[PDB]
């Protein structure tokens, strides 16, 4: 058979009859308006289908058109700069086609439009008659100035080439490759369809070593993240959340940036959809938009709840598709707490047993099966490239408490936790990344790369963290006892800790010279702030009062190192060399 | 002896909801039977029969029902229960969660086929564990000493270094003054957790006897049920049928029971506390009580299962039910981990029930049973005193309780804190323990009688 009939609708669920050769978790199209559903139980000849849209006006006898596929994404050119929802309907194309301000709920508009033509080029030694396996880079499509959309083979099939396309412009419906297998030659276009719940196959997993240069100084030095890693941040109303998200898109070492807004809000989603197309990227040449390497999954709370459950899996599948080309993908999911509310709605719909505070039994399993899709990993194929997927997943716990069935399940899986604080945003301490509760499990991996590339860095981090923990312990006794009873070796730690909290940790994102400091500057300012701290140890154990008044120009040199403008690149290292020896003069005095 | 009738193949599925497939018109179905599902695209899935009623048989596939058709799928009934191929060359290799090789290797040649559920040991022919395992850690060997054949879990949480102290007690496991075959079940672990255990066993050269079973988080949750079952029926083979001392490490046991809750909630079974099934005590005890040693054999099996308690709660259904089956636990804490103690082992909720028979004159020496009770009592009083100086003041305490302050800062830094590769002997541990009792007077050591105070306290 090819159609089924409805035989009854009792809410979101449609128990469709005449469905004998249908599979589980397969997508159908219910009714005359073709409402998208999902087969969820299959009782012999009848299948019950939960429908993603509003079942209203559905008759008994309406055609249930089965697709034979599960919830899958269309992967191909036309995906950078596009805006989808959780089930991948192009929201920018659906407003031009219909000229309306709503989503008409009967719209099967394709995710990649078949009208735009793309310049395809073959793989140039991919001859006719050559054997090819799944994951091989088959062609290259110049989608933008930045993104070379490498057409690949799907990992399911395999064969020998019988026809390749000549280099030119083609649609996403044109036949580009024919492959001969034992039985029948298969042909397919530039677009491949892959299910969102199924992890992309890959050759072998690799440990992550290269760090993510986020650009912020507290993130790149104290609590570093690697490309191929898992990060979590608190998702509160205002601490630094949109600031860290836009700095990750603007000034990271990552080739594409996807952003999954997952069931967010009414007007917080429109803040993202208006500000991201007007951001700017600093390429070697002239300034370009950030939207040439960006793909958004925009999903509000008004949208279907089974699209908000699938918005996380839609994003990570787009993350794994651009991973397979050889790029370094970084994924920002905001937030994973609103996604877990969608799991509680689907489980509450099917009357599933509530395991932990309402949330179903498989909450910790779906979170484990999502963060494990991120990693630096060698892709399938013969050209032998390497890619990565980083995941920064926001967590929005109730009341800012970190004891929650979603929060505690997240912090047991993620390795980096940049703890953004509300009270630090009250004092305008920007960025608001707290350093007491934050951590990073990615130090050892990083420790390899920092002895091939920076060398004198690690011990610098260890003592700088030793200063900040000893500062908080000392600051308790300042109000109880007083600063006049404190020892001479301790009070020099307190002033340099205040020097770290203003020069190193505080970083103004609007002050031009501070938008994207690269690395040596980060090793630069800390090499002078702790050598000053180490030289002050023997200078005290040889008077703290005479050094504080006489170093007021030398301390002003340390308090002004953050103004090394980007017209000063090699010169900044020379000023870092000369400002150190001015400290070396005044040590003997 | 051997099943020689050809297996039947049914295309007669009648219902599929959740992980359960309902097959109709089966002729004489069998409980706990294993089956093989052939999908309409050709991928093969296995499954156990969890309920049979007349002609109907309810199976559950291990890899999930995503894509199982009604007209085109074909299930083939293997006529026996789930038996794994076990061998002596099932050692030195790494396997997945279900049954299959990982390191580009062959399938095992199957010296015999053992049922993975096993069968319980007769308590009349089960000899009590007596000899002590020296693990090289003072918090383990000194206060909560384990025996060879003892089940004892590591009670941990998320983020604490439980994997680091798991690899430490594997390198340093030895008899108190012919190696331990380690079988390792990795369940629901991260990739960096599985790479840590792989690169540690491939570092110390013990990988000629490691039986590592890895089951990552991307692998399905129903295969986590049979993962300790296969990891303990090879250890049963190596110890009761091949005469070899086996150390079994189960991690994570929280990932076992969270996977056990998903299958129970899908079968609509009766829940206990926090959604976990009512038969969770029985299912935890059918993989815990498969340990110890028997009378006619010279091999043994000891179990150290690692579990992370949710939200640091020892009254959660995971560490409470494993505390009722096992023989004492090891409690790695969080508040001692912030102070950069490498084993953050709070010894107050730690216990070893078989430690009494493993200490004494013939086992280590005379003062082991007495210094461990005194180090426990001075740590218990001094920690209650620590909750008094934080609420009243650091100066207005009893003069004896300032020695309890000086004991605790020397207990947590010198006795338990030893480093990732230092392996103290049991005689080194009691010698360090008497140094911390030296700061107390002779008549405040109440739990030690006056006889052995004369031989050890003046030194």
């Amino acid at each position: 058979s090819t159609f089924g009939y409805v035989h009854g609708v009792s809410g979101p669920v449609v128990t469709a009859c005449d469905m004998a050769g249908a599979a589980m978790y397969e997508l159908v199209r219910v009714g005359h308006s073709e409402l998208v559903g999902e087969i969820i139980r299959l009782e012999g000849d009848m299948a019950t289908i939960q429908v993603y849209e509003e079942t209203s006006g559905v008759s008994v006898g309406d055609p249930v058109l089965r697709t034979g596929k599960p919830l899958s994404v269309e992967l191909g050119p036309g995906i950078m700069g596009a805006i989808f929802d959780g089930i991948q309907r192009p929201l920018s194309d659906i407003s031009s086609q219909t000229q309306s301000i709503y989503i008409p709920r009967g719209v099967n508009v394709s995710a990649l439009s078949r009208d735009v033509k793309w310049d395809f080029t073959p793989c140039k030694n991919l001859r006719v008659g050559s054997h090819i396996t799944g994951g091989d880079i088959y062609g290259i499509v110049n989608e933008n100035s930045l993104i070379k959309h490498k057409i690949m083979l799907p990992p399911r099939n395999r064969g020998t080439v019988t026809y390749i396309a000549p280099p030119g412009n083609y649609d996403t419906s044109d036949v580009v490759l024919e492959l001969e297998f034992e039985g029948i030659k298969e042909k397919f276009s530039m677009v491949q369809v892959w299910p969102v719940r199924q992890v992309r196959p890959v050759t072998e997993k690799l440990p992550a070593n290269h760090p993510l240069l986020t650009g912020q100084r507290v993130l790149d030095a104290l609590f570093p993240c690697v490309q191929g890693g898992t990060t979590a941040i608190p998702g509160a109303f205002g601490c630094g959340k949109t600031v860290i998200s836009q700095s990750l898109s603007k000034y990271s070492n990552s080739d594409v940036i996807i952003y999954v807004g997952c069931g967010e809000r009414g007007n917080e989603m429109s803040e993202v959809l208006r500000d991201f197309p007007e951001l700017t990227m600093e390429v070697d040449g002239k300034v370009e938009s950030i939207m040439k390497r960006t793909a958004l999954v925009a999903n509000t709370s008004n949208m279907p709840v089974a699209a908000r459950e699938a918005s996380i899996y839609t994003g990570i599948t787009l993350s794994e598709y651009f991973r397979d080309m050889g790029y370094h993908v970084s994924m920002m999911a905001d937030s994973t707490s609103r996604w877990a509310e969608a799991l509680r709605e689907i489980s509450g719909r099917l009357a599933e047993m509530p395991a932990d505070s309402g949330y179903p039994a498989y909450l910790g399993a779906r979170l484990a099966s999502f963060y494990e899709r991120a990693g630096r990993v060698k892709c399938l194929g013969n050209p032998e490239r390497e890619g990565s997927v980083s995941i920064v997943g926001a967590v929005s716990p109730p009341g800012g408490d970190f004891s929650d069935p979603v929060t505690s399940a997240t912090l047991g899986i993620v390795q980096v936790f940049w703890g953004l604080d509300k009270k630090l945003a009250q004092r305008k301490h920007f960025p608001s990344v707290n350093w007491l509760i934050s951590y990073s499990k990615y130090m050892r991996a990083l420790d390899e790369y920092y002895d091939k590339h920076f060398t004198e860095f690690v011990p610098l981090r260890t003592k700088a963290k030793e200063i900040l923990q000893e500062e908080e312990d000392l600051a308790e006794i300042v109000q109880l006892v007083g600063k006049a009873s404190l020892a001479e070796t301790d009070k020099i730690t307190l002033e340099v800790a205040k020097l770290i909290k203003d020069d190193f940790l505080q970083q103004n994102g609007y002050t031009p010279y501070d938008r994207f400091c690269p690395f040596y500057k980060t090793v630069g300012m800390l090499s002078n702030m702790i050598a000053f701290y180490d030289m002050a140890r023997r200078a005290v154990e040889t008077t703290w009062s005479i050094i504080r008044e006489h170093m007021g120009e030398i301390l002003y040199k340390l308090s002004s190192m953050k103004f090394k403008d980007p017209v000063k690149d090699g010169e900044a290292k020379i000023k870092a060399d000369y400002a150190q020896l001015l400290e070396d003069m005044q040590n003997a005095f | 002896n051997y099943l020689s009738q050809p297996r039947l193949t049914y295309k007669t599925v009648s219902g599929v909801n959740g992980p359960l497939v309902i097959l109709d018109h089966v002729k004489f179905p069998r409980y706990a039977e294993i089956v093989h599902l052939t999908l309409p695209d050709g991928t093969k899935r296995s499954g156990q029969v969890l309920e049979v009623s007349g002609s109907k048989a309810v199976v559950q596939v291990f890899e999930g029902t995503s894509g199982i058709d009604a007209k085109k799928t074909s299930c083939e009934f293997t006529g026996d229960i789930l038996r794994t191929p076990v061998s002596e060359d099932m050692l030195g290799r790494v396997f997945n969660g279900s049954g299959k090789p990982i390191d580009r290797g062959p399938v095992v040649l199957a010296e015999d086929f053992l049922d993975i559920m096993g069968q319980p040991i007769n308590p009349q022919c089960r000899i009590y564990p007596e000899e002590m395992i020296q693990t090289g850690i003072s918090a383990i060997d000194g206060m909560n000493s384990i025996a060879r054949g003892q089940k004892i879990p590591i009670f941990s949480a998320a983020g604490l270094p439980h994997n680091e102290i798991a690899a430490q007690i594997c390198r340093q496991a030895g008899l108190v003054k012919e190696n331990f075959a380690i079988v390792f079940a990795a369940m629901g672990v991260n990739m960096e957790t599985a790479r840590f255990f792989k690169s540690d066993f491939e570092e110390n050269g013990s990988m000629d006897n490691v039986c590592l079973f890895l089951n990552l988080a991307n692998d399905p949750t129903i295969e986590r049920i049979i993962t300790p079952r296969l990891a303990l029926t090879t250890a049963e083979f190596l110890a009761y049928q091949c005469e070899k001392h086996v150390l079994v490490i189960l991690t994570d046991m929280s990932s076992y029971a969270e996977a056990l809750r998903e299958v129970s909630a899908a079968r609509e079974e009766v829940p206990g506390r926090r959604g976990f099934p009512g038969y969770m005590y029985t299912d935890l005890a059918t993989i815990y009580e498969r340990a110890g040693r028997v009378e006619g054999r010279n091999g043994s099996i000891t179990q150290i299962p690692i579990l992370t308690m949710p939200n640091d709660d020892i009254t959660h259904p995971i560490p409470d039910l494993t505390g009722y089956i096992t023989e004492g636990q090891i409690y790695v804490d969080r508040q001692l981990h912030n102070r950069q103690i490498y084993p953050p082992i709070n010894v107050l909720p730690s216990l070893s029930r078989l430690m009494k028979s493993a200490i004494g004159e013939g086992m280590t020496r005379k003062d082991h049973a007495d210094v461990s009770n005194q180090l426990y009592a001075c740590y218990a009083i001094g920690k209650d005193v620590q909750a008094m100086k934080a609420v009243v003041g650091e100066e207005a305490l009893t003069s004896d309780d300032l020695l309890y302050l000086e004991f605790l800062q020397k207990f947590e830094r010198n006795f338990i804190a030893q480093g990732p590769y230092e392996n103290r002997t049991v005689y080194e541990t009691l010698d360090i323990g008497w140094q911390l009792l030296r700061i107390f007077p002779k008549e405040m050591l109440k739990r030690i009688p006056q006889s052995t105070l004369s031989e050890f306290y003046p030194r």
């Binding site: 009357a351 047993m353 509530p354 | 609509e268 009766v270 829940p271």
Partner: peptide, 18 residues
């Protein structure tokens, strides 16, 4: 929740035969 779902499961059993 377990008691009320068990009543609804038994209510479909009597409805199916009758």
């Amino acid at each position: 929740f377990y008691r009320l779902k068990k009543i609804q499961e038994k209510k479909k059993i009597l409805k199916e035969k009758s």
